[PDB]
Structures are given as structure tokens and as C-alpha cells.
Symmetry: D2
Subunit: 256 residues, 4 copies
């Protein structure tokens, strides 16, 4: 089914939505086992690792990327001809962290000028519909019920912020992450296996430092309009203007 | 770089004519190069299209990267820049270009949408952010409507209401470029002029009735995460389909 | 009530000419009542039951409702008479600047407008009811800067000696009206009139409407020291340096 | 004045708690003055409004014009400023304040989903909020049972209406009592100022404890806004001034 009125209200106002129990106990086990099989095929990765391009690596994840349980809520917040921009898995262990990234008005130095909009996450609303160009559906494969489990955390209302947060911090001499220091509007989200966290990538977000033992697991699928390119990092515009990909604005990794 | 006045004009009108950007010798050399390149039939009568001019010619590969085009474009896109298309158009007697673009035109998916995020533009802290702009380099004089003059609906780049759906539903058969419309206006240009265009603007050209060849080369720019321009009919079943699905355009019903 | 096309036009241009709203009979009544008040005619409603009825006429109210879409009140009602060599320099504009004495601002919330779910929300609109034909520039035609009602950069601060109304501007356009036409106007629009050089009286009545929480129009020079000041501090206008 | 982080926070959450604005002495005199107004009638303190504090008391007339209120207010309104509202509030046991405000709540005139008295924007480094309120707390509120200020997250920039669907479906209980996933509580110390974008959908929890809870509220807006006055609808002759609220919980709870 489609997103209810209350769910749209929440995604609009908070920049994300947890849809509980989307995938059952059995499907979740099947997703975990498929990641274990990928470890067997190509051994020798670090224990904290990324699983790039899952739909190509596994027909199980190719189906999950097109599963209507993801696509229907995704269509409801994107409302454009839809394209799969990326699909990857994340395995994390003790002492891993993910610093804050995203945020609506963070700065980027554009050679001869500095800009405070990123049109890959700049979203709007029109005649009863959200239009968010880059959203992500995070399918959790393990329970994350405490901050020391490495819980997803986010800065309240940062998906619609008009002021930059991180440039001031970098030029101030800061060298620690807000996910460690704390911030008056930084909040945690707890989830179960099989939950989907539907995310406006405009939202400034990250995770806490994982302190507990055990493998923290998810699969992430990014979607946007058919005219966006598949996700690829790009350090800068290239001189012949044929460079393609995504140039991040200020993120905590730049100075933490 | 664009002046304050020029920025104001582009923001308020959706476009800017920059007069005499290229000299008469540079124009002639662009014209000469167009005389020997291959064209395709684009589907409009009495129109030839030069597809992918930067690929087919070193002359236009450089023009596409010429700072006389890039500096104004950068000032209205203000994102890491990518070249999305470069093409030429040649037109004779009795050719026409019906209205396309427009900020709030509808697209049916099941659901009906009235935003096209490929042309949805904004403003923030002293800068314009338009994701799809075109630099139109005119290689011929267009001084009267009967020359097939560029025309546009005023303020259509920031319109909040759809214009063309109602027209198709009420049985309209003819294009506003022929009919007329109280806010449809003409732009006249000289050879060597650049027209910098916000693609959210609803625009086209009058029907050309004069002899001679109407000539221009168009270069489209957008952010680095935009795909190179290619029409797409609809999203594909495996969601791997790449391209631009247009909204209502007069060609759908005129 | 406005048609869909009419709303598109009001949205995209910042104004709308509705032709022949009032018949020649009613226009003559309005002209006579203005002769009797003998330049600007303040508070026409409180001075005349004719204009008090006009301010509430539904040929004015219904299009006004379609662009304010808030609980309404009448904020001002005045008449204007002009002869030759009279001129109205440019005022209005979405992003014109104002100094508050410790900072400079580029928004005027009295005219800052928006759109939501099929409806326009313009906090200040004027219905200008014309009582004389204005068919050429030298008649003192209404003129406006295209798209200025949605402008994001200021225009008049940078150039601040002559008025754009005289020298010209690439997007300054003219509007022609017949007697009995209504010019419905978004006050965010930067506008004025050409210099009148012709003979004969130029006559109109203007009614401004806004939300019930807006105060009646009076020009305030600045915020008072006790924060009890009531009224409208205008932003950069041409007559500040012309 | 407001720091950059403070401006960021006001923008993103619709409010800002500025701690320790007023000292213990000042708070006592404010409290003292509200009790002086209580003395007009015999009997115990009752949940009530104290209208027009600036006119009622020289102390509160000065409070309304104090720079510790105006400087932050100015940083979020950025217009020629006008005092729109000045009142005191006493809350006792069993008192409650249901959700009101909200950026896209509906109003039947046709049905409209914008209230231009709270419709705020941003332009070239500055916030523009037409109606903001400085709440000066005269009591500690450190738990929900004390009747803590509560707000629906991000509701100052909501594009969807929340309350119309609840009313039309027969709901008769306030979110404040039932809870809501994005309804959160704000705790304050005596002397704290809560600076508030009135676009925010907010209220307080039901106060379940004894003791009394006091505050003084000052509302500000541009000079072309009228002083606050409830309006039910537009008057017959379009001459009436006032504020017509959109859907609030009081309408149906
Ligand atoms: O691990 C998470 O919970 C979020 C991960 C994330 O935001 C990302 O992969 O970009
Ligand atoms: O021919 C012109 O003048 C404009 C052409 C155009 O707008 C287009 O190629 O889409
Ligand atoms: O004279 C006109 O046509 C318009 C006058 C005007 O804009 C005004 O009265 O504020
Ligand atoms: O009592 C409170 O904490 C809030 C009161 C309030 O929102 C109001 O008076 O408008
Ligand atoms: Cs189409
Ligand atoms: Cs002034
Ligand atoms: Cs009400
Ligand atoms: Ni992320
Ligand atoms: Ni075109
Ligand atoms: Ni005017
Ligand atoms: Ni309140």
C-alpha cells in the first residue's frame, strides 16, 4: 500500500520515515545469508566492509531493489520517473562510526565562488505532493536498539535548513564529530530487522560510534529521477565538462 | 561575469540576450563548418538537426567550452558543471517550433505530477540555481516574427499553474505561436548573439515564412550528476532507464 | 470569479486587466462623484456612499478573493486625478532593499506572496478602476518591470538620477486600459506610470485589500521607539533619489 | 545577539530556548507583579490569563521593550517591529493547552491552507518570521506532568495539514494527552526565554502536579500587523480587524 497521510506528514516534517516490519523474519534471514554467500565467493575483505552494486552481485538483491514494498513509498516522496541510483550493503563491527553528511545548506567551494545549494538533494512540494530528487531506502538486517549499537542519528529539521552548520565548525578549529560530542537537536533512531528507514538525503545524518560486539547490517537503495546519473563520487568538475558524478558539500569527514 | 542588471533580467524573465558575443568572422567560420557536417531528420518539417556537434567537429568542441559561454552559464547554474548536449539546427521556409517547457506543466504517470525536477530552479544567498540552461548561439539574423523568431510565455519559468493541459482538454488544435496569446512575446537577435535560456521557460519559435536559412547551435549545461540529454518515453521496468521525460508540450496535441 | 487562464496570467505577470467591468453609466457616476470632492482623494469610502458601495462591489471582491485567499479587509480606497506633466515613478518590487538602521533587509512581508495547493496567497493587492482611456504612453500609461513581483535581486539600490519610467528599461512594459477596466495588481510588482504629456484628465479609483490582520494603509517612516508604531515602511522606491 | 548555531536551531526547529536571560531578582519582581494583579479578587490562584501586561504594569511595559527580548526577536523577524501582544499566564492543576499553530492547517472561508500571519521565509542570510513570541518563564518546568511545552517537530514548515483528518474521523482526544510520534517536550528553568515561531504547532501537556506555573508572553510582528485580537471570520463590510485561526485542537476536542 501507499503512504498514509500521517506518514507523508512525518516524512515531510522530519526528513525520514521508519516503516516497521516491511520484510518478514524469513526474508531478513535470506538477505543476511546472501551477504554471507558474497563473502564466500570473494574472501579477504576487512570485517567492516561495503558491498558495492548489490543488484549486479546478487539476483536476490536485484529483486529487492525493485520490490514494491520499497518502490511505492519511494514514488510517494520522489514523484518523478524513477531510476535506481545505487544499491549497496553495509557490514559494520565494533569501533566503526559514520560522521554527519548531508544537510540542506552546507557549503561547497566552487573554485571561484562558494555555493550553498546542492541540486541533487534540493527538494520541494507542489499541489499535494513531495518532490525529493534523492531518497534512500535503508533495509536493516539487524536490530539497533541503543546508541552504542551504532544507531542512525540525525540533526532535526536539517533537511530544510537555510543556514550552513559545518563550515563554521571547521573554521572554528573543531576536530570531533557531533555524533560523539552531542548537539542540542541530534536525535537517534532505533530499528528492528526488516524495518525500512526511508530517507530524504537532504537530511544531515550519520550513525553513533558502534561499541558493542556483533555485526551491524543493512542494505541501502538510492533512487532518484531518470535524468540523474547512477551514484558515483566526483571530487570536482572536470575541465572539459565531461566529468560525471556527485560532488559532496561540507561533511564532517573533511575535518574530523 | 554577468552584471547585476543581467542577473536581475535572467532571474525575472527566464532568459538573457547577450549581444555580439562572437564576431562576424567567427560566425562565418561556424557557418562554414555547419555546411559540411551531417544532419539528421528530427521529426519537425523543414528542419535539419546537427546532432552532437562537439563530437562531430573540433570547432564546436571548443565553442562548447568557450568562456564566453561558460562564464554566463556558471553564474546561473552555480553547480559543478557538465555539458549535457551540443547541437545545431537548420531551418527553411514554413518551419515552426511549438511551445515546450514551462515550470508547472503536467505529466501523467496512475498519478499526475506538476514538477519537472530537471528544470526546477531556485535562489539562495545571492545566487541563482538553475539546473538546466542552454546557450543558444545564433548564426543568422532574426529580426521579424516571420523569420521564425524565438518566442516565450512571460514568467512561465516560475509559473505555479499548468497552461497546456487545459488547452488540450478544451479541444485546441493550433499552437499559441500561430494563434497568439496575451503574454506570448518575441525575441529578436543578430548573428553572433547568445541567448542564455532557463529551460523552465515555456518557449518556441514563430513559423518561418521568409527565404534563407535559419541557423543556430545550442549548448545545454547542468550539474555533473545530470545525465547527458536524451529523450525518454517513460521510466523502464528495471528502473535502469536514463533520460528526460518531458511534460505536456504543444506537440502532443497541436 | 477568475478563470484558470486569468489566474495563470496574474501569477506569471503580477497583474491582470479585466476589461469592461463597469458600464459607461457607472463610470460617469464615479467621475461625477470625484468632481464633487473638489491630486489624490483620500479615503473615498468614508467620504462617499457611492465609493463605499464600490469598495464592496463583488466585481472587485471576487477577483481579489481569488488572489489573496485570506479573510479580507479593505486597507485603503483613494482616487487619483492627473493632468499633463504628472508622473508616477517606480515603486514596489519583491527584493528591493530597506535599511533598518542596524541592518539591511531584502524582504517586505506586507507584499511577500506565495502559492500552495492550487491557490495564490498575495497579502496586498489593488483593484485600480480606471475612469478614463489610457491608450498610449504619453497618456501616462501604467508601466511595470516584467517579473519584478518575483525578483530575487534588488534593482533600485544599485543605480541609486533619472527615472526608468523616462529613460526606459529592457523589461519595462506598458499597459493600456479603457474606461471601466480594472487593473488587478500584486503590490509586489515593481510599477509606476509614464509621464503624462497629453491634455485631459486622467482618472482612477484604487482599492487595496489584504488580510484581516493587516493594518489599514498609512506610510510609516520607521519603527517607533516604543514598538507601537502602526503602518507600512516602504522599501527602495524611485522617488527616493529622483 | 543570536549566534549562528542559535539561528540554525531556530530555523530548523521553529523555536529556541535561551537560558538564564533574567536573574532571580528580576523573576521575583515579575512573579510579584502577577500576584499584585491577583489581589483584585479574594481566593486562591486560578488558571487564568493576565491581559495587556504592558498597560497593567510599568514593570511589564519595560519587560516588553527589554533588549534581551528584542535583540533575538529582531534576528528572526527582520522587519520594522511592533509589539502585538503582552499577557501573563497562570496554570494550576488539571490545566491543559491543546495544539494550535501549524504551517499548513486548513481554514474554511473555499478551503485555504496558508495563514499569512505566520507564513515565514528566508532570504540572503536572514529569517523572515512575521509572528514570533518571546515566552518568559517564571517557574521551573522539568517534567511532562508539570505541563511542559510540547511541539510537533518540523510543523513550522509542514506542507500537509495534520488536524483536519483527525477531526473528520471523529477524534475527540488531544495529541497532548494521547501522544504523537513527533510530539516532543521542552523543559525550562525559571528565567529562561523560549523564543517561538508561531508557525510551529505547539501546546502544553496537562499539568498533573500541584504548585503553580507562571510565565509572561510577548508577541511581536511587523508594524503593519494589527495588535492581536481573535476574529471568527471577515466582517460584513470588510472593515473588521483581527486574526482568524485555522484548525486547532480546541475546535473538536
Ligand atoms: O548505517 C546507517 O544507519 C545509515 C548509513 C547511511 O546513511 C549511508 O550509507 O549513507
Ligand atoms: O530555434 C530557436 O530559436 C530555439 C530552439 C529551441 O528552443 C530548442 O531547440 O528547443
Ligand atoms: O496610476 C496608475 O495607473 C497606478 C497608480 C498606482 O500604482 C498607485 O496608486 O499606487
Ligand atoms: O504555556 C506555555 O508553555 C505556552 C503558552 C503558549 O503557547 C501561548 O500562550 O500562546
Ligand atoms: Cs510526452
Ligand atoms: Cs522611504
Ligand atoms: Cs476557528
Ligand atoms: Ni547517508
Ligand atoms: Ni527549446
Ligand atoms: Ni502603485
Ligand atoms: Ni501558543
Amino acid at each position: 500500500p501507499a503512504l498514509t497521510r500521517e506518514q507523508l506528514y512525518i516524512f515531510d516534517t522530519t526528513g525520514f520515515l521508519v516503516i516497521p516490519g516491511v520484510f518478514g523474519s524469513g526474508e531478513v534471514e535470506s538477505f543476511r545469508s546472501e551477504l554471507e554467500r558474497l563473502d564466500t565467493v570473494d574472501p579477504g575483505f576487512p570485517r567492516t566492509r561495503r558491498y558495492p552494486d548489490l543488484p549486479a552481485a546478487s539476483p536476490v538483491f536485484a529483486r529487492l531493489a525493485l520490490d514494491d514494498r520499497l518502490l511505492a513509498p519511494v514514488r510517494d516522496v520522489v514523484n518523478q520517473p524513477l531510476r535506481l541510483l545505487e544499491g549497496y550493503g553495509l557490514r559494520r563491527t565494533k569501533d566503526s562510526v559514520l560522521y554527519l553528511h548531508g544537510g540542506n545548506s552546507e557549503l561547497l567551494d566552487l573554485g571561484d565562488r562558494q555555493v550553498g545549494r546542492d541540486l541533487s538533494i534540493t527538494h520541494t512540494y507542489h499541489d499535494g505532493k513531495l518532490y525529493c530528487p534523492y531518497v534512500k531506502a535503508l533495509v536493516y538486517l539487524s536490530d539497533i536498539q541503543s546508541p552504542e549499537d551504532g544507531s542512525f542519528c540525525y540533526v532535526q529539521g536539517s533537511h530544510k535548513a537555510n543556514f550552513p552548520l559545518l563550515r563554521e565548525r571547521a573554521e572554528r578549529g573543531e576536530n570531533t564529530s557531533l555524533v560523539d560530542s552531542g548537539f542540542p537537536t541530534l536525535s537517534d533512531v532505533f530499528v528492528r530487522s526488516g524495518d525500512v528507514l526511508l530517507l530524504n538525503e537532504a537530511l544531515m545524518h550519520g550513525t553513533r560510534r558502534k561499541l558493542t560486539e556483533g555485526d551491524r547490517l543493512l542494505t541501502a537503495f538510492g533512487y532518484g529521477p531518470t535524468f540523474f546519473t547512477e551514484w558515483r563520487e566526483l571530487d570536482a568538475e572536470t575541465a572539459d565538462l565531461r566529468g560525471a558524478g556527485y560532488v559532496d558539500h561540507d561533511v564532517e569527514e573533511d575535518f574530523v
